[PDB]
Amino acid sequence: STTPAPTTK
Amino acid sequence: KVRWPDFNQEAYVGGTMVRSGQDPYARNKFNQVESDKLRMDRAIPDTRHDQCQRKQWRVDLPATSVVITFHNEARSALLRTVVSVLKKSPPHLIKEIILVDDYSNDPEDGALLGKIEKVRVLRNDRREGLMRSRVRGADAAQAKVLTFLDSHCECNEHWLEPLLERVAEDRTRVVSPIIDVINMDNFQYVGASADLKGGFDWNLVFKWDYMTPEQRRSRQGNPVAPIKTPMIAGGLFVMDKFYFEELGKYDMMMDVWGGENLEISFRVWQCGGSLEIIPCSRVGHVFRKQHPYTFPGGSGTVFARNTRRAAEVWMDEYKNFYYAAVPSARNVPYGNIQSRLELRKKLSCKPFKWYLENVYPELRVPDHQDIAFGALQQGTNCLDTLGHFADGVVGVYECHNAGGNQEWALTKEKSVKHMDLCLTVVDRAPGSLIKLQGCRENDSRQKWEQIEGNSKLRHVGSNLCLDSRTAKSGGLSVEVCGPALSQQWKFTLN
Ligand SMILES: O=c1ccn([C@@H]2O[C@H](COP(=O)(O)OP(=O)(O)O)[C@@H](O)[C@H]2O)c(=O)[nH]1
Ligand SMILES: [Mn+2]
């Protein structure tokens, strides 16, 4: 429903 | 005007803090209590690769107009975004910061920030959505390069120069920073993985794609080289102003949120430019799971409408895969798209097939939809022909998932078919064994329908259900439909 957060380092 | 270090953040943020006992997520869908605890210039970790501190850019970089639209943003987050731009960017490169107040509930959220050095506030007289709001900001921009940022971001060390360098070298490059994560619960700033690209499945929802083994291997020579991306996240990017304009700005008929990132991504690639993610440019963003604001007609409808406008203009025949993946989208009016279709023609853009082959070869095209074959399962058992043919009974046996005597199809003529044989109700008397017989379109005895969440098989025109309670006494039978486990059948595609 929104822009998803990217996998972190 | 006041220099940002002298802005009274306490007075500004204090007028909208969460009251004790009140939900800290209600207004923004992120923790406002935690956002409000942070100073406007709070320090954040340098998430850049070590090689970034050695990479150079030209001295004569073009200044940029930073456009930030916002609708009912948390004051602390909005202020912090503005301050991060001012503190982390070379002053000579920030021509101005244009805040487009998209009809926020309280006009003071934006107006009060207008006293800060370089900040210009433009309040929409009515709700316009992010697409029309960004265009208003872009149209008012005085610099030669545009920078768009969401109203809840935090720029990192030397975030701007690497982006400007790309555009200064080639005006057709639309670039974005690696977008770091600002936790929505406790606002900690964490670095995003650098092995990502922007992408999407056929439902046309933006997602992050992990680089293939070969793509990662090829970047070992220079881990901070630009990353060509099929799609940009959408809210954080830099673009030559004249290029933004001549390429078609944004589709002005798109509303609120959604689909514009897909549209500009397809348009830029298909029409001659390129999209890049620049590793040495880092900007944090508060990712959320739900939008806190209203969508006239609902977010589902609005997203579908905007997406249809993008798909109908840019995807050619491939748009059909979107409708196949999202059935509900076919029944959503999307308005006139002639100006956009004409734009595509004028720009002499390439077909979507070209885009898939040259820009997003990783996206696999789905097979065509047709009748599927599979197994009809009950527990760990599967409907089995028992190796029988015409006039023979059927039963159940442990599923082997190897097809054969356990492969069936639920046809459009409503038959339960195995090759050219169909389940036949030779006798409707409850308890009667069913039999296999050649499939005939006009044999009412071979008609079945799935019921109760596709968990049972009922003989059409009767209250008889396929039942395995007689499996040990001759084979499957028809029995009055009831709560029995022996009447449960699930069709599993395979
Ligand atoms: O009607 C609207 C909807 C969104 N926005 C602004 O557009 C940005 C991106 O929206 P949002 O952050 O909700 O999207 P997300 O990042 O979760 O995908 C934000 O700065 C919003 O506050 C706006 O100005 N008007
Ligand atoms: Mn956002």
Side-chain angles (χ1 to χ4, degrees), chain A residues 1-4, chain B residues 68-73 100 102 127-130 133-134 149-152 235 256-257 285-288 291-295:
Chain A
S1 300
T2 66
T3 301
Chain B
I68 298 172
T69 85
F70 70 93
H71 176 71
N72 293 333
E73 182 59 75
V100 185
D102 190 19
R127 182 72 173 288
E128 296 289 357
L130 69 81
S133 291
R134 284 180 194 163
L149 294 173
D150 275 12
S151 52
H152 34 263
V256 191
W257 174 98
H285 170 263
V286 182
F287 294 88
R288 291 182 282 211
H291 298 300
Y293 47 73
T294 62
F295 279 80

